[PDB]
Amino acid sequence: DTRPTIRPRNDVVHKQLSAFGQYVAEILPKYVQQVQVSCFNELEIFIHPDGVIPVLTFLRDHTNAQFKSLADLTAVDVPTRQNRFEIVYNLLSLRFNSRIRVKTYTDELTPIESSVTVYKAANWYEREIWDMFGVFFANHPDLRRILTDYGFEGHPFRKDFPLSGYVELRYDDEVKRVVAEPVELAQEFRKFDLNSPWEAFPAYRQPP
C-alpha cells in the first residue's frame, strides 16, 4: 500500500535479484536446489551441502558475480528437520553493490567442507559454528572452541541446550581454586508464554 506506515518497496531490485538467481541456478544446476527472493529484496540460493565450495567459488570469482566479501557465516538450528543445522553464508559484491545468501543444511554428524579456501574470513566463523552448534567442518585449518570455556562440554546455541546451562562456577576455599558445580538458580528463569491463540498473519498460513 502507501502512506508512511507502509515500507516502500522497490520492484526493480526484486526483478534484478530474481534474474540473477535464475542465472546462478542455470550456471550451477548440480548444486542449486532452490532460489528465493524475499519481498524486501534479498536473494537467497539454497544449495546442496556438497556444493559449499563450488557455489561459493563461482559466486566469488565469476566476472558477473564478484561476491568477494564473506559478510557473515552463521547457523540456524531447527530441531524439526532431519538436517537440523542450517548453514547460511552471507556474501557481498562490491562491484555490483549487491548481497546474496547461500543456505545449506547439515546433520549433527555429516561434515561440511570448510570454505577457508574460498574466504579466509571463514576460519573464525566456522570455529564459532562448531563451538556453538557442533557442526564439524572438514578440512578446517584449526577447528576448536573459540567462544566457550576451555573445558566446556556441549554446544550452547543448540535449541536443546538449557539457557542457564548445566554447570556454574564459584571459588572454594578448601581446594583454593575456582570449581565447577551443578547449576542451582536462586530464582528460576520465569518462562513466559506469550504466543497469542489468534492467528496474526494470514499470508503465512500453513494449510492443514
Which residues, numbered 65-94, are part of the site for another protein (CB under 8 A)? 65-66, 78-83, 93-94
First-to-last alpha carbon distance for the chain, in angstroms, is 30
The answer to the question of residue 204 lying near another protein (CB under 8 A) is yes
Nearest C-alpha neighbor of 98 from the set 44, 47, 32, 27: 44
Smallest separation (angstroms) from another protein to the CB of 71: 14
Nearest C-alpha neighbor of 141 from the set 121, 116, 113: 116
Beta bridge partners of 112: 137
Selected from 72, 138, 141, 147, the binder of another protein by CB under 8 A is 138
The answer to the question of residue 5 lying near another protein (CB under 8 A) is yes
Could you give the CA distance from residue 161 to residue 141 in angstroms, rounded to a whole number? Answer: 27
Strand pairing report for 69-77 and 43-47: unpaired
Residue entry with cell 528465493:
36
Instruction: Count Cα atoms within 13 angstroms, Cβ side, for 48.
Output: 10
Strand pairing report for 43-47 and 98-106: parallel
Inter-residue contact 74 to 88 (CB < 8 Å): yes
Binding to another protein, residues 15-74 (CB under 8 A): 16-23, 25-39, 43-44, 46, 48, 50-51, 54, 57-58, 60-66
Inter-residue contact 181 to 170 (CB < 8 Å): yes
Smallest separation (angstroms) from another protein to the CB of 75: 14
Smallest separation (angstroms) from another protein to the CB of 89: 15
The answer to the question of residue 11 lying near another protein (CB under 8 A) is no
Smallest separation (angstroms) from another protein to the CB of 113: 10
* Cβ distance to another protein smaller for residue 58 or 124: 58
Smallest separation (angstroms) from another protein to the CB of 73: 18
What x/- string results for residues 170 through 189 when contact with another protein is judged by CB under 8 A? --x-xx-xxxxxxxxxxxxx
Binding to another protein, residues 112-131 (CB under 8 A): none
Binding to another protein, residues 140-169 (CB under 8 A): 143-145, 149-151, 153-155, 158-166
